CSV table of C-alpha atoms in Angstrom, one decimal:
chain,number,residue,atom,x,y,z
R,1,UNK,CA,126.6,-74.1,89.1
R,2,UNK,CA,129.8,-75.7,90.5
R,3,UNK,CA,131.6,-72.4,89.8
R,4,UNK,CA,129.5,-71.0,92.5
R,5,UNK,CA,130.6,-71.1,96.2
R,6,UNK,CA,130.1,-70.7,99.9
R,7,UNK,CA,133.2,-69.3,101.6
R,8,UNK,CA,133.6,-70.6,104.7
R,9,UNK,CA,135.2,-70.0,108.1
R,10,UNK,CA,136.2,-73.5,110.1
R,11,UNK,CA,136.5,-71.6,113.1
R,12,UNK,CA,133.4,-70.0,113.2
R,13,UNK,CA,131.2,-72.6,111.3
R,14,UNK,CA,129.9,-69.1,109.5
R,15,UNK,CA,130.0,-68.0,105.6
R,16,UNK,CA,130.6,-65.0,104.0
R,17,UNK,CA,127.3,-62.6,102.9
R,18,UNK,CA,127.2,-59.8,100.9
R,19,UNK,CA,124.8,-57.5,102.6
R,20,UNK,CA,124.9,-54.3,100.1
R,21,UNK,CA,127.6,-52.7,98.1
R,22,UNK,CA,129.2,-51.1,101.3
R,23,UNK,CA,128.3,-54.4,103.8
R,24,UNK,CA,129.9,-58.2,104.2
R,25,UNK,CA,129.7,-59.7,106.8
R,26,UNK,CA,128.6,-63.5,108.0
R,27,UNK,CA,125.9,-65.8,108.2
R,28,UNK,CA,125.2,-69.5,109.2
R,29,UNK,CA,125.7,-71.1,105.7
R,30,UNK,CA,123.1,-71.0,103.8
R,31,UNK,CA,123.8,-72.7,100.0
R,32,UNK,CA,120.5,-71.6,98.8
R,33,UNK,CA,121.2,-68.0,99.6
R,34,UNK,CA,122.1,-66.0,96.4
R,35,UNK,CA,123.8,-63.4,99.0
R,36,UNK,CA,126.2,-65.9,100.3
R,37,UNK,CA,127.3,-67.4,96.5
R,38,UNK,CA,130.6,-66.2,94.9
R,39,UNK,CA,132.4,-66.8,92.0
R,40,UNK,CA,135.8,-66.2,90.7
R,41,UNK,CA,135.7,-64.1,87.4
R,42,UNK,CA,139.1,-63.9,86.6
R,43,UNK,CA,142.5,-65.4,88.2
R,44,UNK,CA,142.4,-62.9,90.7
R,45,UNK,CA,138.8,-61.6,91.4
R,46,UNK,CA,135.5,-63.0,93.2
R,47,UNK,CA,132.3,-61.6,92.3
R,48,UNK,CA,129.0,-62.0,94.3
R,49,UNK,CA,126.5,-63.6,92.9
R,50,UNK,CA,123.9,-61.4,94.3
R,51,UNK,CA,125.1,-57.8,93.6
R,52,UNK,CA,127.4,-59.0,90.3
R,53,UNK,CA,130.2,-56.6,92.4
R,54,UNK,CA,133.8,-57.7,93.3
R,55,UNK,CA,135.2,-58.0,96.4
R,56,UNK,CA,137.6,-54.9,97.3
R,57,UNK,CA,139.0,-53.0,99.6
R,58,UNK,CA,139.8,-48.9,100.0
R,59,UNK,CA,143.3,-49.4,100.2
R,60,UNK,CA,145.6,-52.1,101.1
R,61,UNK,CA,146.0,-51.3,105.1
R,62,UNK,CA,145.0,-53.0,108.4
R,63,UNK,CA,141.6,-53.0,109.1
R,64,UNK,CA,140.4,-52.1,105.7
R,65,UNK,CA,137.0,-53.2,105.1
R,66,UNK,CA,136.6,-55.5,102.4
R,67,UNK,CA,133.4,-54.6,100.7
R,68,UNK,CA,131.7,-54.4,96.9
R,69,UNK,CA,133.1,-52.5,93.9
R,70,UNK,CA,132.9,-52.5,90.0
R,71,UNK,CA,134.4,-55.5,88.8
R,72,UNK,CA,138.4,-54.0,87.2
R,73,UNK,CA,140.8,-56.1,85.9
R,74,UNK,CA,143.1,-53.3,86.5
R,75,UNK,CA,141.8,-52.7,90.0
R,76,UNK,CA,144.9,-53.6,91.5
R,77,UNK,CA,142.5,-53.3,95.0
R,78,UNK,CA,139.9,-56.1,94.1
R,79,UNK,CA,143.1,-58.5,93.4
R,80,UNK,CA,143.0,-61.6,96.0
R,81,UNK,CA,145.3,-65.0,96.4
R,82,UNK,CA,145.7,-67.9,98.6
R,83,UNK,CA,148.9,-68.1,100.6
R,84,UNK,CA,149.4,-71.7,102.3
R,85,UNK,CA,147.3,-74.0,104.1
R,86,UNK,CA,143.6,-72.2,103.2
R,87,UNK,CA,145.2,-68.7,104.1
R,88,UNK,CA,143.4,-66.2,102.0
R,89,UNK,CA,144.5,-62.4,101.4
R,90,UNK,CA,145.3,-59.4,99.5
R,91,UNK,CA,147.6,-60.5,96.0
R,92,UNK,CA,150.9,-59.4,96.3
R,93,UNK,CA,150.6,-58.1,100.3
R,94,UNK,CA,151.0,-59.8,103.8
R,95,UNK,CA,146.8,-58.7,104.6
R,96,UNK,CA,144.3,-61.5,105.2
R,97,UNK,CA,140.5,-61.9,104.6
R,98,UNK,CA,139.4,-61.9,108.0
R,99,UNK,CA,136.5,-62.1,110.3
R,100,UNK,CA,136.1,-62.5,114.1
R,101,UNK,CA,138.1,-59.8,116.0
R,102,UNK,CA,137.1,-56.8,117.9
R,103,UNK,CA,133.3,-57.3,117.4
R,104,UNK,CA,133.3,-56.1,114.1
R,105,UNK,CA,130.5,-57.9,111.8
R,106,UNK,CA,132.5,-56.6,108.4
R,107,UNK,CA,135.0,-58.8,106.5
R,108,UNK,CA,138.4,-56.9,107.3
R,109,UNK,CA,142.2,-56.9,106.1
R,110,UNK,CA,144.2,-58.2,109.0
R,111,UNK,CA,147.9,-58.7,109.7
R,112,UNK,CA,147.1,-61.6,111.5
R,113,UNK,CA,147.5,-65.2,109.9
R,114,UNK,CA,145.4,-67.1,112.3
R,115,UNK,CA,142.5,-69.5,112.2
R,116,UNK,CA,140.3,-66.5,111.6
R,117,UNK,CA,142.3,-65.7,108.1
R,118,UNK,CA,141.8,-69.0,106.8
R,119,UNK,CA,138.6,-69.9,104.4
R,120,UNK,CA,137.5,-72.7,102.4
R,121,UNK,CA,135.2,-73.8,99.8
R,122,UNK,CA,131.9,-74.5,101.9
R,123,UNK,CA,131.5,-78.6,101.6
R,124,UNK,CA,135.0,-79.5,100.9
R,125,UNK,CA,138.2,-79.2,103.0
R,126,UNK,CA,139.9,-77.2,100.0
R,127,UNK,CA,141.2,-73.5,99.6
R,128,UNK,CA,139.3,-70.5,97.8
R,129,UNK,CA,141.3,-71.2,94.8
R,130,UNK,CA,139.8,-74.7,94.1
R,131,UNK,CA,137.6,-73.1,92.5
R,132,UNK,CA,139.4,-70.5,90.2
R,133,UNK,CA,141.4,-70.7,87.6
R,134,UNK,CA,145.3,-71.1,86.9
């Protein structure tokens, strides 16, 4: 299933795992582990494989942690884009998909636009959105 993906942090050398509905974090890359597979299900939301939830966030604030909800088209919180160069983050606001600061394991929002904001398809050198649609 080409639609399915690894996300993938260059910095790191870690992917993206969806722990529970309230927990994701990372993981060494693993392309045979359902937890770590995503899918884009619409032109602005990606789905885990495993728990068939969205990624989301509470609100769209620093430091958010971005976990699993309901898949809504009209969630306007589950809504997600690429900005340039593989930079990955809220549709709409200036808040990245991040990982790596303060010791927190959890995917967060973050202001920051750094090397730890930017995620590609696992195996390729492309953007999230290589494998959406639009």
């Amino acid at each position: 299933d080409a639609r399915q993906f690894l996300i993938y942090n260059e910095d790191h050398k870690r992917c993206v795992d969806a722990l529970s509905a309230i927990s994701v974090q990372t993981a060494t890359c693993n392309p045979e582990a359902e937890s770590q597979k995503f899918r884009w299900v619409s032109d602005s939301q990606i789905m885990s494989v495993a728990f068939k939830l969205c990624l989301g966030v509470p609100s769209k604030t620093d430091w958010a942690s971005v976990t699993l909800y309901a898949c809504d088209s009209k969630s306007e919180y589950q809504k997600w884009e690429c900005k340039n160069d593989t930079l990955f983050g809220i549709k709409g606001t200036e808040l990245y998909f991040n990982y790596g600061n303060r010791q927190e394991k959890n995917i967060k929002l973050y202001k920051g636009s750094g090397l730890w904001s930017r995620w590609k398809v696992y195996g390729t050198t492309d953007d999230l959105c290589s494998r959406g649609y639009e």
